[PDB]
């Protein structure tokens with residue numbers, strides 16, 4: 001059911017990094033990874049948490065729809081794209097932490113905790129500050145647990161409305177061409193060691209869907225582009241994409 005392919009380690013070694021890629025073939029119900037241990041090691045979700053956070057905010061009416069404008073609070077932050085108004089689509093695209101911190105404040109501790117348990121999301125532990133626990137609190141999730149969560153989202157099986165799930169999957173849209181569609185979310189965890197990057201989501205083909213979750217050591221922001229690059233090299237090697 002689960003197969004380990006250590007030859008994929010070359011895609012990390014060649015870039016002088018270390019990490020895990022996990023792939024799941026939905027048609028065949030078969031999983032593949034370069035490192036079974038790390039695939040089941042739990043890390044801070046960082047901005048990958050914007051997927052569940054979006055779902056919860058939409059289902060509770062904290063976010064009306066993907067068009068509602070979240071006005072910049074006028075505080076200059078060091079990421080230029082954060083210093084502007086956003087909707088759900090652009091806030092996800094630019095991983096706008098302060099917008100999602102306000103979502104979490106409006107969701108509140110109790111509803112956040114219940115919903116993450118309903119989602120079976122990671123260790124389901126929101127210990128810490130309600131507006132930052134996914135960055136430096138107690139919540140943890142593994143690459144295999146990300147895939148389990150994404151598969152439910154894909155099939156609209158999470159315990160929120162179909163509409164909420166459709167909107168979040170729209171907001172996850174990352175790439176689309178005549179060969180495939182990628183819906184995914186990046187993450188970048190720096191507040192707790194080890195610093196890592198995430199990329200989780202799936203590849204839609206004409207006749208199958210491949211779910212993926214990767215994380216990798218990220219000692220500096222210089223390597224963030226390797227999250228997508230390494231994943232796509234694995235997808236290419238496995239002939240999932242051209």
Ligand SMILES: CC(=O)NCCc1ccc(-c2cccc(C(=O)O)c2)cc1
Pocket residue numbers: 077078079094095186187188221224
């Ligand atoms: C204020 C702060 O958060 N500093 C910590 C340093 C930091 C934080 C976030 C990003 C970041 C932002 C948006 C997108 C991406 C990406 O992965 O593409 C990365 C870059 C640097």
